Every structure is written in C-alpha cells, then in structure tokens.
Amino acid sequence: MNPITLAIIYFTIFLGPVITMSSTNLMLMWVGLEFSLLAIIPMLINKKNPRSTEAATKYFVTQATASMIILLAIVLNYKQLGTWMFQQQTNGLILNMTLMALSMKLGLAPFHFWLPEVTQGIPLHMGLILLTWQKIAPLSILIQIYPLLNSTIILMLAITSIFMGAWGGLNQTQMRKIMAYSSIAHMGWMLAILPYNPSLTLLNLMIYIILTAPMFMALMLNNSMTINSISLLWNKTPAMLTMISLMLLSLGGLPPLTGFLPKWIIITELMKNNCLIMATLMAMMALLNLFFYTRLIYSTSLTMFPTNNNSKMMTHQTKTKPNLMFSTLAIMSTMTLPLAPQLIT
Amino acid sequence: MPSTFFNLTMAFSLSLLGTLMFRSHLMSTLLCLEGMVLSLFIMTSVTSLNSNSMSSMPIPITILVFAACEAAVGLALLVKVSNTYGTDYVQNLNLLQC
Amino acid sequence: PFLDIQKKLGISLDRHFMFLSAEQPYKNAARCHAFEKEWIECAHGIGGTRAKKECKIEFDDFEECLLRYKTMRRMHDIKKQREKLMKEGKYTPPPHHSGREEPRP
Amino acid sequence: MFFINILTLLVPILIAMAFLTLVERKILGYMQLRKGPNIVGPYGILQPFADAMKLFMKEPMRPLTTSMSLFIIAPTLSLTLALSLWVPLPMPHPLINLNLGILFILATSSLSVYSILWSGWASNSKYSLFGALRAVAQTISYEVTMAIILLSVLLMNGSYSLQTLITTQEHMWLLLPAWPMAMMWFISTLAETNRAPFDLTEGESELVSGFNVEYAAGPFALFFMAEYTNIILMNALTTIIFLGPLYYINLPELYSTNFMMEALLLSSTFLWIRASYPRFRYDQLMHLLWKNFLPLTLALCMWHISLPIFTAGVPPYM
Amino acid sequence: MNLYTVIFINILLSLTLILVAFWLPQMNLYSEKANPYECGFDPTSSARLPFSMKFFLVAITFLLFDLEIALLLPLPWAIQTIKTSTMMIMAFILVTILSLGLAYEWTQKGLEWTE
Amino acid sequence: AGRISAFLKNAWAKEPVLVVSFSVWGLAIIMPMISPYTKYASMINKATPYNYPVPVRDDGNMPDVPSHPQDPLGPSLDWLKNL
Amino acid sequence: MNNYIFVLSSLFLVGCLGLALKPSPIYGGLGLIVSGFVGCLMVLGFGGSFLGLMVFLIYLGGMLVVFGYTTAMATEEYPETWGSNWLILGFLVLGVIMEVFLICVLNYYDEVGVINLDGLGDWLMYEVDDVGVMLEGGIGVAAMYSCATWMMVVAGWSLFAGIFIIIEITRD
Amino acid sequence: PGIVELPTLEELKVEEVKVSSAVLKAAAHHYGAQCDKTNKEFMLCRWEEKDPRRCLKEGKLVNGCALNFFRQIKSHCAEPFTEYWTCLDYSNMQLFRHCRQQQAKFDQCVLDKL
Amino acid sequence: MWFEILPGLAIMGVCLVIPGVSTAYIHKFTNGGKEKRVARVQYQWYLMERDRRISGVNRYYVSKGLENI
Numbered sequence A: 001m002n003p004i005t006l007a008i009i010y011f012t013i014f015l016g017p018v019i020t021m022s023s024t025n026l027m028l029m030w031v032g033l034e035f036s037l038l039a040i041i042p043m044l045i046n047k048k049n050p051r052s053t054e055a056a057t058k059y060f061v062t063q064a065t066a067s068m069i070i071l072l073a074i075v076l077n078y079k080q081l082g083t084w085m086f087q088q089q090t091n092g093l094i095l096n097m098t099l100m101a102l103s104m105k106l107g108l109a110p111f112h113f114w115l116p117e118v119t120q121g122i123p124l125h126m127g128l129i130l131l132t133w134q135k136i137a138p139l140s141i142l143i144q145i146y147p148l149l150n151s152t153i154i155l156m157l158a159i160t161s162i163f164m165g166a167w168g169g170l171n172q173t174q175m176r177k178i179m180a181y182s183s184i185a186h187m188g189w190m191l192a193i194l195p196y197n198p199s200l201t202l203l204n205l206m207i208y209i210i211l212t213a214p215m216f217m218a219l220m221l222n223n224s225m226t227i228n229s230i231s232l233l234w235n236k237t238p239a240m241l242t243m244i245s246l247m248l249l250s251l252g253g254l255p256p257l258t259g260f261l262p263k264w265i266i267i268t269e270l271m272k273n274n275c276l277i278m279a280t281l282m283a284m285m286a287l288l289n290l291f292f293y294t295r296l297i298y299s300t301s302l303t304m305f306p307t308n309n310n311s312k313m314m315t316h317q318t319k320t321k322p323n324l325m326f327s328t329l330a331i332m333s334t335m336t337l338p339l340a341p342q343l344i345t
Numbered sequence B: 001m002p003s004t005f006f007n008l009t010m011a012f013s014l015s016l017l018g019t020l021m022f023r024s025h026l027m028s029t030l031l032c033l034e035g036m037v038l039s040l041f042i043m044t045s046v047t048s049l050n051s052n053s054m055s056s057m058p059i060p061i062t063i064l065v066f067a068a069c070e071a072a073v074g075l076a077l078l079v080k081v082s083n084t085y086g087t088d089y090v091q092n093l094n095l096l097q098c
Numbered sequence C: 001p002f003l004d005i006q007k008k009l010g011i012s013l014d015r016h017f018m019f020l021s022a023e024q025p026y027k028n029a030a031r032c033h034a035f036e037k038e039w040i041e042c043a044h045g046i047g048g049t050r051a052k053k054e055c056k057i058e059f060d061d062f063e064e065c066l067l068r069y070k071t072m073r074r075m076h077d078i079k080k081q082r083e084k085l086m087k088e089g090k091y092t093p094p095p096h097h098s099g100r101e102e103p104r105p
Numbered sequence D: 001m002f003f004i005n006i007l008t009l010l011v012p013i014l015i016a017m018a019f020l021t022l023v024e025r026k027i028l029g030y031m032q033l034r035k036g037p038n039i040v041g042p043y044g045i046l047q048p049f050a051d052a053m054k055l056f057m058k059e060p061m062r063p064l065t066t067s068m069s070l071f072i073i074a075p076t077l078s079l080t081l082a083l084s085l086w087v088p089l090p091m092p093h094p095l096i097n098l099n100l101g102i103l104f105i106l107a108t109s110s111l112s113v114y115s116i117l118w119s120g121w122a123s124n125s126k127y128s129l130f131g132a133l134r135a136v137a138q139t140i141s142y143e144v145t146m147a148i149i150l151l152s153v154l155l156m157n158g159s160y161s162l163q164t165l166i167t168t169q170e171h172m173w174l175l176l177p178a179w180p181m182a183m184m185w186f187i188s189t190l191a192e193t194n195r196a197p198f199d200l201t202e203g204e205s206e207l208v209s210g211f212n213v214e215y216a217a218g219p220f221a222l223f224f225m226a227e228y229t230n231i232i233l234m235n236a237l238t239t240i241i242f243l244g245p246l247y248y249i250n251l252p253e254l255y256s257t258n259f260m261m262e263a264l265l266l267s268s269t270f271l272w273i274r275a276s277y278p279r280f281r282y283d284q285l286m287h288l289l290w291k292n293f294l295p296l297t298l299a300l301c302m303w304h305i306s307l308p309i310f311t312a313g314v315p316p317y318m
Numbered sequence E: 001m002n003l004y005t006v007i008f009i010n011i012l013l014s015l016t017l018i019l020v021a022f023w024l025p026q027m028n029l030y031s032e033k034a035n036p037y038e039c040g041f042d043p044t045s046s047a048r049l050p051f052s053m054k055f056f057l058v059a060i061t062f063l064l065f066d067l068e069i070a071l072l073l074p075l076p077w078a079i080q081t082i083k084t085s086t087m088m089i090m091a092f093i094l095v096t097i098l099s100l101g102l103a104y105e106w107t108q109k110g111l112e113w114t115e
Numbered sequence F: 001a002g003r004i005s006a007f008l009k010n011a012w013a014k015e016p017v018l019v020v021s022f023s024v025w026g027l028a029i030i031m032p033m034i035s036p037y038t039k040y041a042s043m044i045n046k047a048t049p050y051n052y053p054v055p056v057r058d059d060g061n062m063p064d065v066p067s068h069p070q071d072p073l074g075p076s077l078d079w080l081k082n083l
Numbered sequence G: 001m002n003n004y005i006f007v008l009s010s011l012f013l014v015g016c017l018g019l020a021l022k023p024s025p026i027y028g029g030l031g032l033i034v035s036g037f038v039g040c041l042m043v044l045g046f047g048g049s050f051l052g053l054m055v056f057l058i059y060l061g062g063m064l065v066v067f068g069y070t071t072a073m074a075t076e077e078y079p080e081t082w083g084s085n086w087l088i089l090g091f092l093v094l095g096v097i098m099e100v101f102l103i104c105v106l107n108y109y110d111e112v113g114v115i116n117l118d119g120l121g122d123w124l125m126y127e128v129d130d131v132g133v134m135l136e137g138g139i140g141v142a143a144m145y146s147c148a149t150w151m152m153v154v155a156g157w158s159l160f161a162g163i164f165i166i167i168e169i170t171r172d
Numbered sequence H: 001p002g003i004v005e006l007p008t009l010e011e012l013k014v015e016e017v018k019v020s021s022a023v024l025k026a027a028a029h030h031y032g033a034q035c036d037k038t039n040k041e042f043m044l045c046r047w048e049e050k051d052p053r054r055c056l057k058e059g060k061l062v063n064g065c066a067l068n069f070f071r072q073i074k075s076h077c078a079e080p081f082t083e084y085w086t087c088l089d090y091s092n093m094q095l096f097r098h099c100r101q102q103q104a105k106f107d108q109c110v111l112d113k114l
Numbered sequence I: 001m002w003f004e005i006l007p008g009l010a011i012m013g014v015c016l017v018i019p020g021v022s023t024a025y026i027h028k029f030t031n032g033g034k035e036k037r038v039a040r041v042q043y044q045w046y047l048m049e050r051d052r053r054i055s056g057v058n059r060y061y062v063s064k065g066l067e068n069i
C-alpha cells in the first residue's frame, strides 16, 4: 500500500485506543473500538490469499457482533439512568453483558476460539499488533468500571482462560498459535485480578507486552512459524538463543525473571482478599505453560536439530535485523525482577 | 414507552440470535448485524425524544455513521470471500483449523 | 477516563453532554432536569461509595422521575379500582371526565 | 370533505397522466415529421383510454419461473408511490402539509426503485435481471448528487418544507441564484425517472424491455402509469423549487394556473429530449454523475454554505 | 390521520386495479406460454446464477457517501447557531474530506469498473 | 510561474468542470474572510428571540438594564432595520 | 389509536424475527426495509421527524447496494423463502405464538412494570413544551456543528478512513 | 410520601380573556408595551418560584391587565381593530406582512386616541 | 399540423389545475372561509387548541373577538 494509505490506516489504528482511553462518554469509547476494528482489517488481509481472507473474515464477524452487544449495554444504561456512563446504580445485567462482550473482544475463554485461528492466518507483525496494542482498548474500558464488575463472572472467565490457554498451547506446533494461547492465558491473569487491584492488571499487561513484542520480533527475524523452523536458529542466528530462552522462561513465570513478578503479585493480592481456591488453581495450571515453553527451549537452544544444506548460503549473507528495540525489550523483560518494588507501586 | 422498549429489546435479541446462529450465506449474517443496528438506533432515538435530551440526538446519527462503515467493510470482505470460492458460504472458511 | 487528557489540557471533547441536565440547544431543559441536577450535586466530592448510600434519596427520586414506575403503578390502581366500581354500578364519572366539560379559557 | 379532496387530486392526476401518453406520442410524431395518433377520437384524445382498456382485457402473465409475491407487489408499489409523491406538493396549498416534505419526496422516490428491483428479480429471467441491475447502477449514480443539490438550494430557503419555497421565491425565481444547480438538478430528474437518454433499466434497444419484459396486461399497465405520473411530478417539483409561480394570497387560482403552465412546459422538454438524443451507456451514466456533477455539487454546497454567511443572508427558521 | 388515509386510498386503488387485471381477462394457461422469455429460444440456464458486479467498489463507496449526506442534512438548522464560525469551519472540512476521499478513489482507478 | 499558465489554460480548455470546482471551492473559503458582512451572521442569529427573555430582579444596582422595554437602554436592533 | 405504538413495535419485532431466520438475502433485505419503515414510524410517533426519515433514507441506500451484492455473490439456484422450508416456517409461526404468550404472561405477573396492556397509550409522551418553537429533532442533531463538534470529527474521520480502508481491502 | 397540595377549584377562578389568537396577535405588540410591568412580575415569580401554585395571584393580575387593555380598545378603536385582526386571521400562519394597511389604521387610532 | 397537439395538451392543462384550485377552495370550505391553519411548531399548535376551546362549538376556526368580553 502507498504511503497515503499507511499514514491513514496506521494513524487510525493508533487513534482508536487513544479515543477509547481519553473518553468520558461511553459512545466515544465505543467509537474508538470501531476505529480499531475497521482499520486493522486491511492490515490483516494485506497479503490477500485464502488464509488471510478467512482470518480477516472470522475477525470481523466476531468483533462486530461483540461491538453490537457492548452498544446495547451503553444504550440500555442510557434508558435506565439518562447518562452516558456506568454508575454504581447501573443494572447488574447491563454490566455482565458488557463483560462478556469485552471478553469476546479480548479473546478470553470460553469466547476464545477465534483468536488462535486469526493469529494463524495473518503475518507475524500483525499478530504482534493484534496480540498487544489491540488489547489495551477493551482493557482500558474494563479498568474504568472495576468497582462494578461481578467477580464471579470475572473469575470463571479467568480460570477458564488459564486452563484453556494451557491446554490449547500444549498441543501446538505452529508458533503463531502458541502465541495466541499464550495471550489467552495471560489475559486470564489480568482479568482475575481486575476487580481487586486494577493496577496489577496494568503491570501484568505491560510485562506481557514487553515479553510478547521481542518474541514476535525474534520469529520475524527469520520468518519462522513452526517448531521445526525455529529449531534452525542455531545454524541461522545463534546469537539469538541466549535471549529467546530467557524470554520463554520469563513468559513462563519462572523466577528470578521479570515474568514471575506478575503472577506472584497477583497471587499475593488475590489472597489478601481470601481468593485462595481460585489463586491455587491458577498457579497450578500456569505450570502447564512452562512445559510447552520448555519444550520449545529444548528444540532451539538446549539441542541442535538437524539442519539442511541450503542454510549454508544463508550464513554467507548479512542481516540488518534485529533493531535496537529488541535488545532493550529483551533485557528489561528478563533482568528486572530486582526492581520489583518500583513496578508494583 | 414501557411496552415499546420491551418489543425493541426483544427485537435486538432476535437479531443477536440470528447473528449467532449461522446458516450458509455470510451475506445473511451481515443483514442480521444491520437488524441490530436498527434496533439500537430506534431505542436511542426513542430514549432521547422521551427524555427531551436534545444534546443526545447527535449520538444516534453516529451509530448510523459507524454502522455503515461496518456494512461497507463487511461487504468488501464478502467480495474477497467470493473471489476465492465462488460463493459466500461460511463452511468454506475453515482452512485455519490447521 | 483512563488518560485524563481532556482534564489535563482543560478542553472538553465529550465531557459537556454526559447527562440529562447538561446544556441543551436554545436553553430547553431535559425531562427531570431538576432531579438530576440535585443528584449530581448531592454526590459531588463524596465519592461513589459514599454517594450510593448518602444520596439514595436524591437518586430514588430521579429514578422515579425518569422511569415513572410508581406513577404508572398508582394510575393503574386508580383506573382499575374505578373499572371495578363501574361494572358493579356504584360510580358514574363526572361530566368533565366523560367528554362534556366547559373548556378553559 | 377530505375524501372529496383526494378525488380532486388522484383523478385529475391520473387523467393528466394518461394524456401525457398522448402528448408524448404526438410531440414525438411531429418532431419525426409525422402525425402520431389522431384517429381514435378527435385528434386521438380517446387513444389513451383505448390502450388502458385493451391492457386490462389482455390476459395477465404468471410465468412458471416467477416469484409471484414480489412479481405482484412490485407494480402495486410502483403506482402507490407515484400517487403518494403528490400529496405534499403545494399548489399553492398542499393536501398534506409536512415540515420535512423534501425528505418525504427524497425517501418516497428512493423506495420506488425497489419496484424495479423486485419486479426484475422476481421475473427470474435474464433480461429482467439485467434491467434490475441497471436500476441499482442508475440509483448509485444520481442519488448522491441529487440529495446534495437539494441541500444547496434549501440553504437559501431555510427549511425542508415545500410550502416555504413559495415564500422564498416571492420576488425572484430560485433559477437565477441557482441556475448551475438547476442544470444539474434537471439532469438528475431524467435519471430518477428512467427517461431518455437515461432509459437504461428499460432500454428496448439492448434489453428487449428490461425489468418489465415478463409483464403483460394490467400489471404492466400499472408500471407505465407510475412512470408517467413521476414525469409530471418531478417537473412539477422542479417548477415549485426553481421556477416559483406567482403567489398572491388573494389569488390562489393564479398560482395554480401559472404552476401548471410551467409544469406542462417542463414535461414537454422531457418529450423534446427523448426525440433528440441517443441513449447513454449505463457505465457512462455513473461517470457523468460522479466525475462531473459530483465535483461541482460539492463545490456548490461549499459555496452556498458560505454564501448566506458572508452576505448576512441566512434564511429564517420559520 | 389524513396522511394515513390518503395512502391507504392509494394502496386500495393499486390493489383494486390488480384484482381487475387478473379476474377480468379470459386466461388460457399452458406450459409453452408461461415459460421464460429469451428471444425465441430456450434459456440455457436459470437466471438465478451469480451475476458479476463490475461496479462493486462504487457500490460500497455509495454507502460511505450516503452516510455523509446524513451529516450534511442538518445544515439548514445549523446555520441558525450563534457559533457561526464553528458551524462553517466544520462544514467546510466535512465537505473537503469527502472531496479528498473522492479524489483519492478517482486517482486510484476506483471509479473505473473492473473488466 | 510560466509553465503554470500553460497548464491552467490546458486544464481550462479540456477540464473546465474541475477548474470550476476548485475555483468555487477556494472562492467559498475566501469570501467570509474579506466580506464586511460576515460579522452580522452571528449577530442576526443572536438577535432572533426564541426563548422568553426572563426578567431579572431589580436589586437596585442595575443602572444599564431597562425597566420598560420601550426604554432608551438595552440591546437595539437599529443596525438590523437599516441593514 | 391507543394501540398504535404497540402495533408498530410488534410489527418491528416480526420483521427482525423474519430477518433472524435468514431466508435468501433478497428477502432479508426486504425485511430490513419494512422494519426500517416501521421503525421510522415509531420515531415519528414519539415526536421525532428528522431521525425518523434519516434511518429510513440510510437503510434505503444500504439495501440497494445489498441487493446488488446478493445477485452477484449470495445467490443460489433455489433461493429460500420463509415458506420454502417447513422447519423455518415452523419457527416463524411458533415465534409469533411465543410473543403472544410472553406478552400475555409477563402482563399477568406485573401488570404495569414491563408490559402494561391495561394502559397502552397513556404513557407515550411524558412532557412537551406546549408553547415551544425550537424543538425539532433536527435542531438536536444539528448540534454537531456547534456544541458536539467532536461527534462530527470522529464521524467524518470514520467515513474518510473507510474509503482508504475499502479500496485496499478490495484491491486485486 | 407527602400529600400534594392543590388549590381548590374556586381558588383558580378568574375572568378569562376569551379571544382568538389572531385577536391577541393583532394586539400583541401594543399589549406587550402596556401590560409590561404586571406581565414582567408574573414571569419573575414563575422562574424564581418554579411552582405554579405559588404565583396564582400575580397570574390573576395578568388576566386583570389583559382584560383592561382590551376594554380600552373596545371603547376607542373597535372598528379599526376589528378590520385588522379579521384580516390577520385569513392567512394560514397569521402573518403580519399581509395586513400592513389595516395595521396602519389601527396604529393611527391608538396613537391619537390613546 | 403542430397545433393538433393542443387538444391533448389543453386537456392535460385543465387536469393539472383542478388539484390546486380544488384544494384551496376545499380548505376554505372546511375552515370557515380562511386558509387551513398551518402548525409547524408546538406554539402554533397550542394557539389552535386554545382557539378550539374558547370558540364554544369545539372548532378552532370560529374566532371570537371583542364581542366576547
């Protein structure tokens, strides 16, 4: 696409969440959700082949249906209270329908089946955008109404998302699905702590973003979609194995990496509220994430899979990637646990 | 007013049922997404008129503005789905299971 | 908001038509402007949790003006009790309720 | 007394519609160096009634492949909307006084495109489907400019009420401050009413008869009555908007007589145009409207937004 | 009420002419009369098959421009505001981006029909 | 400065619709800036009295608020009669 | 005339029931026109005018395009109608039975709260400035040019971006 | 919870100004400049009090002055006034601009006579 | 010749004047010899309703002037 289209489309993608985040009125929050939905569509389907077209279609009908449900909440609330914002007096069922619709937009299970497939049909950089920047708008709405959310709905969604994300990711050889199920599981953690401490949902989002960004950038370095494709990194970009491994352990919540901090503080704050049972199952199923992250580490940095003859040409050539952002996000996403007290508050 | 919102709200539910219960054509599911926009627009219009809130009457227009864009973007996608398989049947959009 | 930019810059992109009692074109009050203006002034500065209990009087009145549940109930009871009397034959409406008043002015 | 007032609207219009078919055939005649009808009655005056009677004794068609519900609905809708476009017209006092009459005319006119679409689709024939998909193309062509042209003219008028155009044009036709929009408005009305050189939905040359190829008898008669009623109305509307007839509150008979003379004259120019030009290609109709009229109409919309502002000539709300 | 009366009267006339057209003529139905028309030969295929739309991009661009009419139609009321500078500036920009959007599509061969 | 005239003459010959469209578009943005009447558009709209002019209680420190409407004080529409 | 609004909302409901059963998009586009028209009449009954005619205008142009797309992309040999299939015909009939039941039931257990059949018409217009002048919905919608100019920026940008969005989506 | 206090039907009795709108509109400009002080106090009462029950005295002085104003025209300028509003009544919007000739005669009666 | 078009053009002319003339007169015949009152805004509708109430015959067009006070 020509530079005018990129400027218009990339500005609109950026504009959406900023409108949702800066808006007092609910209809303007909805408007920002529409900008993101509309402008991402051309980006997703740019390569125009049978798979990205299905991906851009499944995404549209999912996110448009969820939009209509959110709008119904915004309108039933204006009927009940004559105002364009949710109040303590807003009907209970109005809030729950907003929650289910937004979770449908985030990809939280059981409204999750679309996310792994859409992430699979699109290029890596748009998976990065979809799994990161596109989550801030629905989440910023939820953080604005956390005093009102029914915790029983939120915890069932979070428990479901942590389980389904673990089980789903355990069966995947496609990296883009492993990233989608990774996302689903982490959204479970952000959502579980939402009605209690919304600040910890922002900590878990930010740490997830700076872990998920370099991971995509790492796969975008050689355009590697499979476990066998990523297994050739020792013979292609061996300098990358040291930080891919840590980021994967960091995404797994293993100490003493930055990714342990979000799970650990969420568990700590959940049990300040006596949320013992939910917290225990959440931490016990987060163990399953580490297993299929460990399996990836086995295939890439801790063993050498067979390589092919044509990869010798690849070595004669010179790469201009990755950029200075990959190194900055790799270190901060793994070696920042000793700064934990400065991140929570 | 009480009886009207109940009928309008049930109208929105029927279209949400229509959207969530696919048949063959993707175009038919697009028309249900317009049944929902029409129900929401009529509710907002009646709410604003009944309460005499003139400052809220811009809002029903924006719903139509941001509903057309979806209808346009939805129809644009339906062209790409037809250019691939020659129909708009949803059962064809299933490559991504693997 | 989540990024109080409008408040920081001191502008108002959408803050000025949030509720019924907001400014209307040609100074046309909205229905229940009096009640809402009371409720928003009651619950101002004390926070949402205090306001849910300490401005329950203002809110339940605004809620009644807006939705009129009790008003329709009450007028349903008067009309239904009159229906019962008239079937028995113990009440005939006045001339001014049966379409024969001396109109004012 | 209101029912009698419907009679003195729907009957004179229907009689005037029929004779438009006779005037069309004789003006086209003399323009082609012949005489047109002149045997069926004195100078053919009975020819319209013969054609009507013959069409309603002709066997009606129920094709085996046809979708009957829409097949029948479509001609019924066509003639209903043609007659309904008339009830708001102020001449100089309208039968039904609407605040947003102009929108009622825009909205009713658009809905009548569905009689072409549904009939063509319901015929389940290839030539009738070609005709329907030209109705879609023709509407996409003229709709955008036609609404904006009205917006430009109504910013000198102050409202969407048709009866307020009488008062706007008390001292001058809107044709003078607005002749560029009248020129573009006039061509739109030829496209709105499927009139040559824009008879693309019918287009006997390319499509045998277009959307109504499978229609015979009385159902086909209703389509024509609708087509010719619209011609009078669109030219009657153009007479009110742009050629404001003389209005004296003491002589309402003057306004009607002057209104009629200009409406007849504009209706003739439709017949004059049909005899003079070849038919557009329906792809070229879109290019005419989107690449010529639309750029000019947007500029005139911006001209007429600013024009009342920098002359302090804002029309009154009432 | 008048506007409801006049339109039922219009509908009843259209209905009444429809009934007379079907029950007055003498009808003789047989299969070869009621087949579809196609210039004297049998159709080679049903008329319900897909019919490619060579102007589809203009069709959906009509929708976007159709809603931009819905934003300009309040102008007759809007020129009654005290904030004339604002009303005018918003109006000029709105029409100008519709024009800028139209120019982009025109130069991208978007108004051209697909061959 | 020399080639433009050649272009403009060229466009004016073969594309007057666009040359007319740009001129009218650009002429509509200049005319409000330079007209000596653009200021009255707001004033006339402000001088049209839809709502009732609710009177104010005369405390006693109102020396420039008329008592009776036919007083020599208050906003006047002479500029509009003689406009 | 006391049942007037109730009937319009009942017709609106069916139009969306027929729409939800999803026959051929030729008929689904017919239900949206009749629901669009019915819904237009509701906004008129409640005192609207500009909002009534606009939603009718906008949905008239949307179904024109949708018709063009149906004949090109969403058409099969034997288009389905509401009577075409016995199972759909069952749920259209049954769907109407349910509303006659839900309205009658819910009217029995509250009598006023939701459906107040006893008092249809009594509660349509609540207040109205009887000596007003400036009250048309057009004046409220026109506030986008002065007071809620932000509404128009996002609306204009939405449409402006959409042209760029669709040209890229449909590009070859 | 409280009992709304309503005035009794004999608290609401006044002498009515039973003239058609054209009659009021024809006399509207002079009446605004003659019954102004009485009129201007009722409106102040109404916006200050926000209650119709609290101004049922100022509002009966509105009817007091409106009737006096018409009695002064029914005793000095009855026929110039009757030609004017009878001509203002004809128009369907009761527009002043169709009666500038009768209007002048009625003005040149109140001015000289009153 | 060409003037043989006139017999039909004249019929069409008479037909197109009956609507305007008949409606104007019918309005006067059903509104006491006055133009049918137009009500664009609520204020004008209020005046008609008040005129209907003070007429004494429940018709808004039966005006009462100074005779009545």
Ligand SMILES: CCCCCCCCCCCCO[C@@H]1O[C@H](CO)[C@@H](O[C@H]2O[C@H](CO)[C@@H](O)[C@H](O)[C@H]2O)[C@H](O)[C@H]1O
Residues within 6 Å of the ligand: A002, A003, A004, A006, A007, E107, E108
């Ligand atoms: C990426 C964000 C940063 C850039 C910010 C946005 C400003 C960009 C300025 C550079 C603009 C260049 O963008 C310019 O776009 C036009 C269309 O508009 C393209 O031009 C295109 O249309 C013209 C129309 O005559 C034809 O030649 C052809 O169809 C095609 O080339 C140019 O090839 C490109 O040079």
Ligand SMILES: CCCCCCCCCCCCO[C@@H]1O[C@H](CO)[C@@H](O[C@H]2O[C@H](CO)[C@@H](O)[C@H](O)[C@H]2O)[C@H](O)[C@H]1O
Residues within 6 Å of the ligand: A010, A011, A014, A123, A125, A220, A223
């Ligand atoms: C305030 C405005 C904010 C603007 C925000 C801008 C965010 C930055 C966007 C960066 C986009 C560039 O990122 C994207 O890079 C990838 C490579 O990874 C390119 O993507 C590429 O994928 C593969 C191989 O990589 C190629 O076969 C393909 O043809 C090409 O598209 C895209 O063409 C480019 O768009």
Ligand SMILES: CCCCCCCCCCCCO[C@@H]1O[C@H](CO)[C@@H](O[C@H]2O[C@H](CO)[C@@H](O)[C@H](O)[C@H]2O)[C@H](O)[C@H]1O
Residues within 6 Å of the ligand: B014, B017, B018, B021, B022, B023, B024, G017, G020, G021, G022, G085, G087, G091, G094, G095, G098
């Ligand atoms: C209960 C009365 C109240 C109204 C009920 C109707 C509400 C609206 C429902 C709209 C959805 C219809 O739900 C319908 O579900 C059926 C399965 O049953 C699915 O339909 C699918 O299976 C059925 C059954 O063989 C086939 O006839 C159909 O052609 C096929 O598409 C679709 O997903 C949806 O068309």
Ligand SMILES: CCCCCCCCCCCCO[C@@H]1O[C@H](CO)[C@@H](O[C@H]2O[C@H](CO)[C@@H](O)[C@H](O)[C@H]2O)[C@H](O)[C@H]1O
Residues within 6 Å of the ligand: D309, E084, E085, E086, E088, E089, E092, E093, E096, E097, F029, F032, F033, F038, F039, F040, F041, F042, F043
């Ligand atoms: C990105 C798209 C941008 C392209 C479109 C740009 C449009 C820009 C239009 C600028 C024109 C504004 O023009 C401006 O009009 C206003 C009011 O109308 C005038 O303002 C004047 O009149 C107003 C009332 O009308 C008075 O209250 C004010 O005190 C006085 O200054 C300005 O003197 C003139 O400069």
Ligand SMILES: CCCCCCCCCCCCO[C@@H]1O[C@H](CO)[C@@H](O[C@H]2O[C@H](CO)[C@@H](O)[C@H](O)[C@H]2O)[C@H](O)[C@H]1O
Residues within 6 Å of the ligand: C083, G002, G003, G006, G007, G010, G011, G014, G117, G118, G119, G120, G121
């Ligand atoms: C597309 C299909 C549309 C069909 C929709 C249905 C149309 C019929 C409307 C049914 C709604 C209720 O219709 C009618 O409402 C009135 C008041 O409004 C009810 O109530 C009426 O009778 C009751 C006693 O029973 C009395 O208080 C009084 O006379 C009146 O209120 C009636 O019992 C009911 O017959």
Ligand SMILES: CCCCCCCCCCCCO[C@@H]1O[C@H](CO)[C@@H](O[C@H]2O[C@H](CO)[C@@H](O)[C@H](O)[C@H]2O)[C@H](O)[C@H]1O
Residues within 6 Å of the ligand: A015, C011, C012, C013, C016, C023, G146, G147, G148, G149, G150, G153
């Ligand atoms: C980077 C992406 C965003 C860039 C594009 C958007 C730029 C903003 C343009 C929209 C500007 C709206 O500008 C905003 O208008 C509103 C009303 O319209 C004004 O707000 C005003 O509203 C009403 C006016 O009756 C008053 O009651 C209120 O007190 C006053 O604040 C704001 O003071 C002004 O800031």
